Design a binder for this molecule. Structure first.
Ligand SMILES: [Cl-]
Lengths: 126, 132
């Protein structure tokens, strides 16, 4: 059994992932990992809920409700959003290769935000 | 077990990838951003290979040994280079055998993260390590 997150929680996670994407269009290390997490979760939520509880029309609009990271404030804001998503996944899904894949991808987002922040601090403006 | 990519690797190729992952792991098991990603890839492939090969092609005793199987820390430029090449070998082999999809994408991401970590460690060695 895969485990399950409530629909309201999926909704919150989808919103946070979209916010990170909107901020990272020009940072493909970040965006490609977020897209992976989003596409994975879009797949899972369909499996966790019947068509009766979650109609196609409502489903197809939950993770896909139808850009350069260059400031410290932006690294911090994104790190916080990543923490929100990671904490939520850890709270709701069992330890296993399925969830590990997402947690590793989210950690790699943090590795990118860390590299960016470091570059700003050393080579950017006071 | 039924969930894996729509393709397969030759047994000799699995063995090579196993060897490369083990070598990376032996050299970096104290670099947790590298080792945790490598362990994920090893564990994943270990599950897949069992379904790709029958018990007569790959007996249980042979199977157990395929993926399973110094300071343990990356501290030289030489090691960064070696590991970067082993990572490249693994990544190149995966794309040669498994089609694009979420299943293999998880692996390719983890392996890209290893490269992100090698890069950070390399920069630390260059700036803060021995200038001669
Ligand atoms: Cl990663």
């Amino acid at each position: 059994p895969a485990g399950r997150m409530p629909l309201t929680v999926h909704r919150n996670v989808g919103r946070w992932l979209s916010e990170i994407l909107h901020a990272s269009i020009r940072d493909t290390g970040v965006s490609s990992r977020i897209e992976f997490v989003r596409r994975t979760l879009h797949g899972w939520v369909r499996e966790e809920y019947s068509e009766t509880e979650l109609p196609n029309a409502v489903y197809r609009n939950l993770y896909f409700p139808v850009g350069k990271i260059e400031t410290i404030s932006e690294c911090d804001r994104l790190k916080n959003l990543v923490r929100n998503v990671t904490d939520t996944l850890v709270e709701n899904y069992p330890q296993g290769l399925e969830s590990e894949a997402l947690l590793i991808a989210l950690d790699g987002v943090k590795l990118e935000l860390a590299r960016i922040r470091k570059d700003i601090e050393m080579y950017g403006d006071p």
